[PDB]
Ligand binder design. Structure first.
Ligand code: 1DB
Ligand code: 1DB
Ligand code: ZN
Ligand code: ZN
Ligand code: ZN
Ligand code: ZN
Lengths: 627, 627
């Protein structure tokens, strides 16, 4: 059978254990998440210009009765309900947030003549909807300044919902960002990350008790066009004190924590501390499972300590770009200390263990937070997990290899699987044993062993169905939203298979030219490039950049600021026009006839290079070997 | 039986295949490695001041007959003999190198009044011995300048063998380094890295056909005290043109390639290009298996391209801090192009594959260099490997997790092993099957499956002996020196068990104070720190630094430039005296009585904190679960 199964007796027991272990009696977050509520719109339904739906919350109604469901980890269910506390809120005098209109929050700070806005959600429609709610309740005011707290799409993505380029061009609107913002906002492993993200975000799952229920730092991500307008002003060095529209702001740069470009904000008049995405209502990711570079827990901890000693000590309210605020100086001091020691403990104790010989394959089964950190709701592994972050720290310092040469040169899973199956007496015998293990509630073992059979025999329905059943129990048990979604998406694909039916101008415009060509080098089909050699001078006059492109030894090189008198072709095109070509907004033929694409030398080389560029299928297999 | 076994028939066949696949007819390296030889001392034996032996080459005599040995990959054997071409060499007019006195080379450049020296080997005794050979053959000359090509111990370690602090202090000797040198020269995962390095370096193996034979970039690493004298001058930005003792030097910074602080050197008078450790006689590591952060192949490739377009185009000789030079402009241009496209192809094609859904557990079995790159001796995987570097690139962008939730929350190997064994019919049945697989030459499979049995039953001699036999065949087959050494060290420990019998003042002095306390936080025993809280102001007047130390929530924090009026204790000590304490060169009691260690507040806190500090056993288990 191919439909979700009820929670097993072992899964039920695991949920009861969560309740026994975690401080459910501490319900203060429920008060915090409702404090200062101005308006919760009755229903929320946000639409995109093309008619698609950007965001809606009606799919979460099953959570509203607040009744426990054993197919959901009760800690995650608690977070799931708190994230449904959406609408317009007062944080402090003249500081408001619209929460639950998208994954992130959007913050409106009262200036003398308009709003200073912090962040802009993921897509213009959600941002626009938030601004409309603000105007209905507080009165319409022009937005004078938009500040990006950091370089992530759930924060800069909806900017065109608030302001337009002509406002920025005229100086009516300023955009403030931490130094390094443009370099960090925008690729090379994009298809792999996006496809792996369908698991983490559970994009194929229904919203419900046996599907997606929450995304930890918010309900989920709004769907729509991605916008991005470049900053007009950057916060340099350690930070800067600015006055915006009569309001004093202190910006504290925290480079290389949750994002390479990030800054906390202190508002001294309100004694309000906006902790960007450094401190949120959950342990955050040191490693995002969809795939990204490992983050620096050591710096993350130190920057939280820096904020504590500078501001925390005088703060009356602390708030963030995800989740809800926390009021009271003693509460804020403790949250800052604990979040600082959370990242610090994860870092320090992973390394303490590693230095004792505990490997990347063992550390998550050994490392446990001490009670003082374990027993706070904002330290729970909803977004990041202690388990995956400990392995992340270890991977950052020691790498993927566990040091045991048995594992140094491993056969691909699909190549060793047939032998595992044979050694275990064949598929039927393996299933018999795995089913007995399943009946004992040993899901973490079952998913490892039955995965071998699925890889040996991807058309073995019985194997896929058992693997799916065990993964699903693990998803029900998961406190982590990303783990849950991944387990349930894996079950879904094992049961149903992968779909057989299957661009942002601003994002492309933000991409450095060198990175664009690095990406084109990634698209290069090695088979097509084999034995070829060509050099092309590329000139981009609007941005005043020159690149030397060299294809040789089945590799595309690009080099900024150099030209070769020996290149076989010289090509001139504005970066703006190159952008349009890639976005299919203009044809190369029309550009050549307009005199916008120019060439000397052999007119064919760039075309020949383009013809070697391959493509990537989005729906590649994950839970089985490639079809 | 517990002694090395002969190469199997499959291993022999694998060696013959290497010969069929690789260009052994290309023997030009043999001429290159002998070119400009001035003196090869008859025997080489270098001793340390305490009487220990730093370096000797007599253990490699078995290689001298040049006869093929099937327990050594013939490509590695070729490299092993070329690395035995040691002694004093002329590279170009007034440019000499002493090769094979240590892992790295040391370079002497004739100035008007003395030597400009590039790098200093690993330990003073080897450096001193190299200088003595130089003086015997070319005449004794003062060393006026020492340049560190980059921030690695096999390059700055022997500096005290050449110069002393009073020479630097008086300005008689200058030390030049790339900007960032001191930050990159010096920890947190040190015990784990060092212990894992016993495998990579094969520190327990004899020198011989069934032991250690070479270390790729050199024969091995000299053993002795580690020295380091701080630079007096840093090469800033992209680089700088300097004149040293009448000789013109162009320094090209290449930050974040083989080392975070590295610079190539162009010598325009001799048209000589010293490629630091960017281009050597082998594919280098993107990931060193002993464990370290993943290196940036993209930047590595671009920096090689930058050197090519700036200098390569006019170079007559190219040489490096490891291995031998290559003469002739056409040869140099090709080597630079190929090394550039080597790192570029590894990067680009790993990502091309990953974007198609190929995982970190599959990529090394899919990625292959094109013939133009595969068929050059300096592109062979002696130091780095295509296999481990491809997985490294993938790990850098996507992380350790393959995206399949079967693998998201894995049981530790020792906890799932008992079940693998049971499912496979028990130990005897598993061995029976594994022995048949062994008889078919399926070593990569045998080491994966028998490893399960060793982990289930670490005292099962029969299992350990088979695992050892299979690993050993893999070590014999390995072209990579680190892989070979690791496979043979694993066999050694399985057969014999781990030893049951078991500081650099300069290195400690080079360590930032914050990093020192970060390291102390890593030593913190969480059990001992539980429930404790303390704050200590630490003042270090000689360096003018203040730190706030806070222990809370089982985590030690240190914060530069802040002090707390609420700290329970204030401690004052020069960093120089703190160094001496840690090195056991002075007792804390003697320092307090000398007035060199001062305290206000509760005199006990720092002592209490120190008492919570744990230690790490060096010889932790790798190939079995912890004893
Ligand atoms: C349209 C893309 C939206 C991107 C929103 C996700 C934020 C990226 C950072 C990953 S993490 O969630 O901080 O761990
Ligand atoms: C006494 C320690 C000697 C360190 C020498 C090894 C160099 C460190 C860098 C690793 S790698 O060999 O570049 O990949
Ligand atoms: Zn973010
Ligand atoms: Zn965010
Ligand atoms: Zn090095
Ligand atoms: Zn080196």
């Amino acid at each position: 059978t191919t439909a979700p199964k009820p929670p097993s007796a072992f899964t039920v027991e695991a949920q009861r254990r969560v309740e026994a272990e975690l401080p459910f009696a501490d319900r203060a977050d429920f008060e915090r998440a409702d404090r200062g509520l101005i308006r919760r719109p009755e229903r929320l339904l946000i639409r995109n210009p093309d008619g698609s739906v950007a965001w809606q919350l009606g799919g979460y109604d099953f959570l509203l009765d607040g009744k426990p469901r054993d197919s959901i980890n009760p800690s995650l269910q608690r977070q799931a309900l708190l994230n449904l506390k959406y609408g317009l809120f007062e944080v402090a005098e003249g500081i408001y947030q619209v929460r639950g209109f998208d994954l992130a929050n959007i913050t409106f700070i009262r200036g003398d003549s308009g709003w200073i806005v912090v962040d802009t959600l993921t897509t213009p429609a959600t941002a626009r909807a938030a601004y409309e709610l603000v105007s209905r309740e507080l009165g319409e005011r022009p937005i004078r300044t938009v500040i990006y707290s950091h370089a992530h799409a759930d924060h800069f993505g909806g900017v065109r919902g608030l302001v337009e380029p002509q406002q920025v061009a005229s100086g009516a609107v300023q955009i403030i960002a931490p130094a390094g913002f443009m370099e960090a906002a925008i690729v090379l492993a994009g298809n792999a990350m996006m496809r792996r993200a369908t698991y983490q975000y559970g994009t194929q799952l229904p919203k419900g008790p046996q599907g997606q229920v929450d995304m930890a730092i918010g309900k989920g991500l709004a769907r729509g066009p991605l916008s991005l307008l470049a900053p007009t002003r950057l916060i340099e060095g350690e930070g800067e004190d600015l006055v915006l529209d009569g309001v004093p702001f202190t910006f504290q740069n925290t480079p290389g924590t949750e994002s390479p470009a990030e800054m906390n904000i202190w508002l001294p008049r309100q004694k309000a501390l906006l902790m960007a995405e450094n401190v949120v209502g959950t342990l955050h990711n040191l490693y995002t499972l969809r795939g990204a570079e490992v983050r620096d827990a050591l710096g993350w901890s130190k920057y939280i300590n820096q904020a504590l000693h500078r501001f925390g000590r005088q703060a009356e309210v602390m708030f963030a770009v995800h989740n809800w605020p926390r009021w009271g100086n003693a509460e804020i001091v403790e949250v800052l200390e604990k979040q600082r020691d959370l990242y610090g403990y994860l870092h320090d104790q992973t390394l303490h263990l590693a230095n004792q010989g505990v490997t990347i394959g063992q550390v998550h089964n050994r490392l446990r937070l001490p009670p003082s950190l374990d027993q706070e709701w904002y330290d729970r592994g909803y977004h990041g997990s202690v388990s995956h972050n400990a392995r992340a720290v270890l991977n950052r310092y020691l790498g993927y290899y566990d040091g045991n040469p048995a594992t140094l040169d491993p056969l691909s899973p699909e190549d060793s699987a047939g032998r595992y199956v044979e050694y275990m007496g064949g598929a039927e015998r393996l299933l018999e044993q795995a089913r007995a293990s399943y009946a004992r509630g040993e899901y973490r073992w079952v998913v490892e062993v039955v995965n071998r059979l699925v890889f040996a025999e991807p058309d073995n329905r019985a194997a896929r169905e058992l693997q799916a059943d065990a993964l699903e129990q693990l998803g029900y048990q998961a406190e982590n939203a990303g783990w849950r979604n991944s387990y349930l998406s894996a079950a879904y694909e094992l049961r149903h298979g992968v779909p057989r039916d299957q661009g942002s101008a601003d994002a492309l415009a933000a991409m450095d030219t060198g990175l664009l060509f690095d990406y084109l080098g990634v698209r290069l089909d090695a088979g097509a490039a084999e034995g070829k050699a060509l050099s092309i001078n590329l000139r981009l006059p609007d941005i005043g950049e020159n690149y030397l492109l060299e294809l040789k030894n089945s590799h595309l090189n690009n080099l900024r600021g150099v030209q070769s008198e020996d290149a076989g072709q010289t090509v001139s095109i504005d970066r703006a026009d190159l952008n349009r070509l890639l976005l299919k907004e203009v044809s190369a033929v029309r550009l050549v006839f307009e005199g916008k694409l120019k060439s000397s030398g052999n007119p064919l080389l760039l075309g020949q290079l383009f013809g070697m560029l391959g493509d990537f299928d989005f729906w590649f297999d994950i839970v089985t070997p490639a079809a």
